[PDB]
Design a protein around this ligand. Structure first.
Ligand SMILES: *P(=O)(O)OCC(C)(C)[C@@H](O)C(=O)NCCC(=O)NCCSC(=O)CCCCCCCCC
Ligand SMILES: Nc1nc2c(ncn2[C@@H]2O[C@H](COP(=O)(O)OP(=O)(O)OP(=O)(O)O)[C@@H](O)[C@H]2O)c(=O)[nH]1
Lengths: 224, 37, 51, 419, 37, 84, 165, 387, 152
């Protein structure tokens, strides 16, 4: 029995590594029925193709859509919200690093999906924007229209902050939110320095630049 | 097509003994302000 | 913190440093509580060649 | 689902439902596939994790037990739930040793009703037995559809037969989409003010609101979502609100039950439901292009026929609780679904509930208010007022004529099986 | 400059106490001027 | 010589309210330990023993098996002269 | 002292030493979150039916406000009431001593009871029991044999062959 | 939490509140270090507010005109501030002015006394006034101002008001009609007033039932205050398991060391106290009055009195030093020492430790009345350690 | 479900066990307020539910002769509970049993750590009982041997 139990342990660990060995240092995302875009391994090529910039004072973007729809335009709006959540939610958080993006599929017969925008100002109520695409406009255009609406709503909600200085303070003190994202850095570089090697890096701190080894001058001469 | 766990699949071959069952059992004062009315 | 050896260069990560005190601290007088009912204080004064 | 809104005050009864073993959570994946309309309740319920097993803590006194028994589709799960309910009710009865007993006169009036119920009982059971052998449909599936039909699966089989009678799929979900809770409460307060000028209270009490929250499954709690109610939940809310808001004295429980069943019928009728319903996005003010403020009449009638169906099973399940001596005999042999929310309202309360329900069903069948139009007519309101007042006064004065009325009205509401 | 204001809060406690002791004697002196005149 | 029923009720009320399984809003001066409070028999043994803690008197086995209601606990301690 | 879990798996030598032990002190650190290899070992120790006590080391890095949420997660990890510990500050040894004290007396009981069983068996005339008692009562000084040499000389394989595994 | 909160999303009363605030600022011990100019300003404001309240009351002169509860609370305030009110109303330092002010106050109190006579003649129900109302009525009917040595007095009225207050206390202690938040049965000030009335009627209130009800009331109040202080200073998570396994034990037995009485957190800051500025003082004085009342009772109720004394003593040990009033605390301590002079078992050790720690805490050189210090000297010279 | 006699017997046993646990928490200092009470209640309720499920399975003249066996089994378990209460009463004198009860009240480790302390408790009491007898018979034997040697 113990032999088969150890074999089971080995197989379980092997599959868990094959799934998460290059992503073991990252936290795990939510296991919701709309957050399938968080467990997939995102190509850095797609992440570079889709670079969305939202207002820095925004903190959360949620996209709620319904599972089943009884109306044709309701099903169309649900598909639009699903496509937007699968296309731009991960790029937004990956390129902003201060916003938390989440999508969810409510198991109900609704025909109007929506998006919720939360700002860094706790004293400011969140905003709700419905997904109401034009029947004549295609899905590829409706997704871009929803993205435009979301970006403009984020801009308005960030500009309508109560105390911009306090908002900047809480932004500077807030940690990173996209630590769960599984990015496959393909031929670009395993390290940010390897990625930006084609550029001159002027932003460095001498405390970290200074080598902290014995005979560091000898080693620097050998390296140079 | 959506979440496969939510997607329904049929059970053509199922064992009566395959069912599993287990039994487990579950294991400030304040001040009173007075206002004359 | 000030070095303990001049032979060891500052580039050595395991260089020893000991603390030397620059100021022992800051002090203020102690002023007790003065009772509302008994403000008058009686005392004895001993002066050696003081006016 | 036998008596919407019929609830009594009792403590919490915890029960741990086994969800499976990590990582092969078979019961949990079956629940994910089946409990889709009650997935909000499922996700809201707490998750307790043992060392190597998974359990969920449900409240047997709350609607959790009945919802699981109705939507389970798992024979051994619902069997364990039914057996635990029966055993805990037996233990509670043996420990209480003193339940309130009804009068022997009214119990004799209800005893003769089962003699006529047993004729349609065999017919309605065959409908439930035939539906079990039709589990090969991709809509609803079961483990052993060829096995013998048992007593605990009655709720699921009744739900399936009601779906087949309505002929509209996901009618409960389509009705929950158009039945928000706040607008339903507002329309119910309006109807209560129309029915009673000063006889109604200003609002409901906190204990009653707590009982309602325990008996109604919760919806999602997102930022933009609103509390939506199923049609059965709206019926239960109407019944509970009326029965708790009428200013009839606590000793005159019969008139309170009559008002409760009147509100239950006002909620079960399709015209009033579609008239008082509105889309959730319109109620919230989010969207103004897909207003669709009116509920689809086809879905409304198809979902009201579900609640209209199966009178005999409900009457039998309530007669089981009408007397404690007969409950010990009919809990393991006769057709009966056990609900912990029926135990605090013992013999007297449930007997008066049965009588009031029979009388209200007969009044509705006689006046034809189920389909005509516009129940808010002042003439119909005054007629209902006079009906409830006369019946309450008669029940207080002379009970023999009331029992004769109950017998005649029972023969009226549930006719004998023909051919 | 925010930490500079935090250092003044430590020493402001002892400046209020010196102003209180001087004002207490001012009140006590005026009481004596009335008891005798 | 005997404790008054008002004081002996406040004590038994405060114990069942501060109990580990009983809710404050569910208890009332006229309530049953099993039906109105929802406690099991092994929990009734605990709440009676908690009453034996504040009232230094010792209750025998037969006289403790009769205390299934809060009013029953009040009547027993009131008639018992050995209560502090 | 056993080696850590490398690549989510403990070496075979460590598994045999853990099985030989009576109890286990699962030492986890607070600077890093709970990792899958820790959960894999926790369930392995559970399936082996061995007493394990959770010890949360490196508590000196925890602030006064975050100690609540940290211990809540450690107590909901299957093992109850994780012991806060700090090896740099040497905090928690008197608290760890109170936990290993019952196991100390239980082992003392099993040892004396086993000695009585072997004594009774040897009085019956069993050679294995008399030989066991002879090795016990033989009170002589241990001979420390150190096997040293150069790297890759095969001394680790030499002791493994001498021991038998 | 963000998801959850987003899913969720000159009146007489003001005059009375101002009078109460100024009185607590002038009488609380932790404000004794206030500057003298501020003390004089607060005292002038308090005198002016009390004069305005008394003027309003004497101009109304009818309970049914304004209120009953408001009138009773206003008269309780005026009674607790009689000397300042008299010095403000007489407007001069003269015996004739004092007599005039006292006569005016007697005239104004005749209204309340006649209202009490009318109520006790009509036999009103206890639902008329709350427990606070009945206690204030008992205070204003038993206050020595009526017999200072021309008012309407009646011992039947006194006994009726006393019985009504006791019945209202019983009702309030048995109702417990709170949903989830637990409140105190009675304010510390009203509890002190009730026990003061019981001290005044000690010749008539020797009833063990009344003494037991009062002891239970003050025990509940002390339990509230102690629970507040304990929630304020509580041991942390890092020491929770250490206390569960070891329990504040020491490495070596005979170090020697100081025996800890209560387990709390290590020093972490200032931890501003939550209790009011006079809660501890009122609790201490009320417990002193309770012990003075129950000095001669049966052992069955004496046990409950001693348990309440132990609860109040624990509350005092938890209370800070600036909130501890030296005079009232030393009075309470010497009374507890007189009680400990009786040979007690299994609790004399901890009681002696509590009392001696509380005595070492405070400053005996700052005590106002020297009679308490002399009695403490006697009690400590006559005190015997446990066996 | 369970007959009234067995219910009354188990209630008396549980009350005795609670009284003994409180007396032990008083006599030997258990530094946690609830202490052994929660653990004892949990274990007792778990065993009671196990035996109730066993009786439910047994419910399915054969039932007449099996109910007597079930009653004898319950009586044996109750005698075990009473002996355990006696051993808890004798614990506060010994310091090892005090440490076992203290660690059980604190509730550290896992089910296997809390079970080896629970099972070996009564075994430790029996071992302390046998140890005195062994030491006494050995000292009497060596005294007789010394007296016999001194005679020659
Ligand atoms: P009530 O009358 O509703 O409860 C009656 C119950 C007990 C529920 C019966 O229905 C029942 O289940 N009876 C049979 C079970 C029974 O009698 N159990 C007695 C327990 S004996 C036992 O083995 C328990 C030992 C636990 C001791 C734990 C040791 C911890 C100390 C460290
Ligand atoms: N802050 C803090 N650091 C500690 C503490 N204990 C150990 N460390 C640090 O953690 C590092 C781990 O040292 P080890 O004892 O070798 O860790 P290990 O468990 O033996 O790990 P491996 O042998 O590599 O499997 C040490 O170098 C210490 O600097 C502690 O209690 N607090």
């Amino acid at each position: 029995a113990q032999y088969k139990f150890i074999r089971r342990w080995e197989l379980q660990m092997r599959d868990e590594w094959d799934q998460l060995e290059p992503f073991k240092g990252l936290p795990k995302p939510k296991r919701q029925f709309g957050n399938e875009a968080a467990e997939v391994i995102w190509p850095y090529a797609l992440l570079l193709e889709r670079v969305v910039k939202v207002h820095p004072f925004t903190k959360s973007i949620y996209v709620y859509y319904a599972q089943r729809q009884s109306t044709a335009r309701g099903k169309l709006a649900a598909e639009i919200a699903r496509s937007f959540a699968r296309e731009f939610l991960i790029p937004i958080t990956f390129h902003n690093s201060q916003v938390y993006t989440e999508a969810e599929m409510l198991l109900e017969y609704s025909e109007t999906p929506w998006v919720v925008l939360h700002s860094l100002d706790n004293g400011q109520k969140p905003r709700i924007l419905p997904v109401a695409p034009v029947e004549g406009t295609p899905a590829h255009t409706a997704v871009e229209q929803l993205l435009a609406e979301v970006v403009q709503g984020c801009e308005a909600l960030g500009a309508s902050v109560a105390d911009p200085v306090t908002a900047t303070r809480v932004l500077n003190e807030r940690p990173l939110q996209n630590q769960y994202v599984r990015v496959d850095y393909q031929w670009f570089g395993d390290t940010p320095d390897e990625r930006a090697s084609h550029l001159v890096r002027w932003e460095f701190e001498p405390e970290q630049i200074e080598p902290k080894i014995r005979h560091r001058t000898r080693h620097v001469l050998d390296w140079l | 097509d959506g979440p496969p766990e939510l997607l329904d699949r049929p059970e053509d071959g199922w064992d009566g003994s395959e069912e599993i069952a287990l039994s487990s059992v579950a294991g400030x004062x304040x001040x009173x302000x007075x206002x004359x009315x | 913190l000030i070095e303990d050896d001049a032979r060891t260069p500052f580039s050595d990560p395991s260089k020893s440093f000991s603390p030397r005190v620059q100021s022992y601290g800051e002090y203020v007088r102690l002023t007790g509580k003065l009772p509302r009912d008994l403000p008058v204080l009686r005392f004895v004064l001993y002066r050696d060649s003081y006016s | 689902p036998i008596c919407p809104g019929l609830c009594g005050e009792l403590a919490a009864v915890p029960f741990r439902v086994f969800l499976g073993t990590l990582p092969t959570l078979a019961v949990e994946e079956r629940f994910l596939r089946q409990l889709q309309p009650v997935f909000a309740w499922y996700s809201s319920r707490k998750r307790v994790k043992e060392q190597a097993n998974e359990f969920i803590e449900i409240d047997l006194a709350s609607c959790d037990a009945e919802l699981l028994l109705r939507y389970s589709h798992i024979y051994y799960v619902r069997r364990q739930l039914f057996d635990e309910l029966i055993e805990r009710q037996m233990t509670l009865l043996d420990s209480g040793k003193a339940p309130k007993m009804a009068e022997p006169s009214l119990l004799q009036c209800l005893a003769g009703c089962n003699m006529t119920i047993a004729d349609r009982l065999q017919l309605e059971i065959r409908q439930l037995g035939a539906a079990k052998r039709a589990a090969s449909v991709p809509g609803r599936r079961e483990l052993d559809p060829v096995a013998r039909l048992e007593v605990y699966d009655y709720a699921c089989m009744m739900r399936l037969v009601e779906e087949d009678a309505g002929a509209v799929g996901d009618a409960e979900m389509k009705a929950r989409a158009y039945l928000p809770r706040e607008v339903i409460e507002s329309k119910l307060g309006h109807l209560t003010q129309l029915l009673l000028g000063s006889d109604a209270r200003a609002a409901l009490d906190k204990k009653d609101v707590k009982l309602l929250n325990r008996m109604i499954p919760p919806d999602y709690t997102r930022v933009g979502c609103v509390e939506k109610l199923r049609p059965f939940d709206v019926t239960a809310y109407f019944r509970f609100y009326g029965e708790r808001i009428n200013n009839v004295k606590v000793e005159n429980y019969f008139k309170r039950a009559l008002w409760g069943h009147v509100y239950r019928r006002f909620a079960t009728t399709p015209s009033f439901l579609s008239g008082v319903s509105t889309y959730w996005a319109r109620h919230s003010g989010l969207d103004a292009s897909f207003t669709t403020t009116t509920m689809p009449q086809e879905v409304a009638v198809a979902v009201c026929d579900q609640q209209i169906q199966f009178p005999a099973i409900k009457f039998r399940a309530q007669y089981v609780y009408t007397s404690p001596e007969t409950a010990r005999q009919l809990w393991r042999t006769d057709a009966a679904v056990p609900l912990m929310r029926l135990f605090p309202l013992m013999g007297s309360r449930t007997a008066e509930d049965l009588a009031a329900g029979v009388l209200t069903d007969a009044f509705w069948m006689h006046l034809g208010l189920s389909e005509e139009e516009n129940l808010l007519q002042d003439s119909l309101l005054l007629k209902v007022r006079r009906f409830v007042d006369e019946v309450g006064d008669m029940y207080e004065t002379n009970i023999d004529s009331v029992l004769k009325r109950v017998d005649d009205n029972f023969k009226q509401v549930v006719p004998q099986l023909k051919a | 400059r925010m930490k500079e204001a935090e250092e003044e809060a430590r020493y402001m406690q002892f400046r209020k106490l010196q102003d209180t002791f001087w004002s207490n004697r001012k009140v006590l002196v005026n009481r004596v001027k009335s008891m005798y005149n | 010589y005997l404790l008054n029923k008002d004081d002996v009720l406040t004590r038994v009320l405060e114990v069942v309210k501060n109990f580990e399984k009983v809710d404050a809003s569910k208890v009332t001066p006229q309530s049953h330990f099993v039906n109105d409070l929802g406690l099991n028999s092994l929990d009734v043994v605990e709440v009676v023993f908690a009453i034996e803690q504040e009232f230094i008197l010792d209750i025998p086995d037969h006289d403790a098996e009769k205390i299934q209601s809060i009013t029953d606990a009040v009547e027993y301690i009131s008639q018992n002269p050995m209560a502090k | 002292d056993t080696p850590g879990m490398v690549q989510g798996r403990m070496v075979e030598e460590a598994f045999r030493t853990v099985e030989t032990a009576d109890a286990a002190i699962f030492v986890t650190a607070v600077d890093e979150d709970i990792m899958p290899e820790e959960l894999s070992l926790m369930q392995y120790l559970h399936l082996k039916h061995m007493p394990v006590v959770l010890l949360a080391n490196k508590m000196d890095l925890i602030q006064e406000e975050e100690e609540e949420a940290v211990l809540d997660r450690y107590n909901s990890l299957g093992f109850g009431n994780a012991i806060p510990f700090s090896a740099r500050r040497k905090s928690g040894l008197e608290m760890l001593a109170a936990v290993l004290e019952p196991l100390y007396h239980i082992h003392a009981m099993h040892k004396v009871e086993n000695d009585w069983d072997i004594e009774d068996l040897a009085m019956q005339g069993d050679e294995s029991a008399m030989e066991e008692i002879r090795e016990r009562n033989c009170s002589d000084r241990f001979i420390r044999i150190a096997i040293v040499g150069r790297t890759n000389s095969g001394k680790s394989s030499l002791v493994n062959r001498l021991v038998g595994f | 939490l963000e998801e959850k909160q987003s899913a969720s999303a000159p009146p007489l009363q003001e005059l009375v509140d101002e009078v109460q605030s100024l009185h607590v600022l002038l009488s609380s011990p932790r404000y004794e270090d206030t500057p003298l100019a501020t003390v004089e300003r607060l005292q002038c404001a308090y005198s002016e507010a009390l004069r305005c309240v008394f003027d309003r009351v004497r101009n109304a002169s009818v309970g049914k005109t304004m209120s009953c509860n408001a009138l009773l609370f206003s008269w309780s305030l005026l009674l607790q501030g009689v000397p300042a009110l008299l010095e403000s109303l007489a407007e001069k330092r003269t015996e004739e002015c004092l007599v005039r002010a006292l006569s005016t106050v007697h005239e104004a109190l005749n209204i309340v006394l006649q209202e009490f006579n009318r109520i006790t003649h009509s036999k009103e129900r206890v639902e008329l006034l709350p427990l606070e109302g009945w206690i204030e009525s008992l205070d204003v009917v038993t206050h020595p101002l009526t017999n200072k040595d021309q008012c309407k007095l009646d011992s039947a009225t006194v006994e009726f008001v006393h019985s009504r207050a006791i019945q209202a206390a019983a009702i309030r202690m048995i109702e417990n009609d709170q949903s989830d938040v637990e409140t105190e049965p009675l304010d510390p000030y009203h509890l002190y007033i009730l026990l003061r009335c019981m001290v005044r009627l000690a010749e008539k209130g020797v009833n063990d039932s009344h003494i037991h009800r009062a002891a239970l009331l003050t025990g509940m109040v002390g339990e509230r205050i102690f629970s507040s202080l304990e929630r304020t200073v509580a041991p942390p998570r890092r020491y929770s398991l250490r206390h569960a396994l070891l329990g504040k034990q020491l490495r070596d037995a005979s170090k020697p060391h100081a025996i800890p009485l209560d387990v709390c957190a290590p020093p972490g800051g200032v931890k501003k106290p939550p209790t009011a500025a006079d809660d501890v003082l009122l609790l201490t004085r009320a417990c002193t009055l309770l012990m003075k009342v129950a000095t001669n009772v049966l052992p069955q109720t004496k046990f409950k009195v001693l348990e309440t004394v132990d609860t109040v003593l624990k509350t005092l040990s938890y209370a800070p030093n600036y909130d501890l009033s030296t005079a009232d605390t030393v009075i309470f301590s010497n009374m507890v020492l007189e009680e400990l002079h009786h040979v007690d078992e299994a609790s004399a050790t901890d009681r002696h430790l509590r009392v001696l720690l509380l005595l070492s805490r405070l400053r005996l050189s700052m005590c106002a009345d020297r009679s308490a210090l002399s009695h403490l000297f006697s009690c400590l010279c006559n005190l015997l350690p446990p066996h | 479900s369970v007959p009234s006699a067995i219910r009354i017997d188990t209630r008396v046993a549980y009350r005795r066990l609670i009284k003994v646990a409180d007396q032990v928490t008083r006599d030997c200092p258990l530094y946690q307020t609830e202490g052994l009470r929660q653990y004892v209640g949990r274990r007792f309720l778990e065993r009671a539910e196990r035996n109730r499920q066993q009786y439910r399975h047994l419910l399915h003249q054969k039932q007449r002769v099996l109910t007597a066996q079930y009653g004898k089994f319950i009586a044996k378990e109750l005698q075990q509970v009473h002996g355990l209460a006696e051993l808890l009463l004798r614990a506060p004198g010994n310091t090892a049993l005090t440490s076992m009860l203290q660690v059980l009240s604190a509730g550290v480790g896992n089910v296997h750590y809390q079970q080896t302390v629970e099972r070996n408790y009564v075994r430790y009491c029996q071992f302390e009982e046998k140890k005195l007898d062994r030491d006494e018979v050995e000292e009497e034997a060596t005294s007789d041997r010394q007296n016999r040697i001194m005679q020659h």
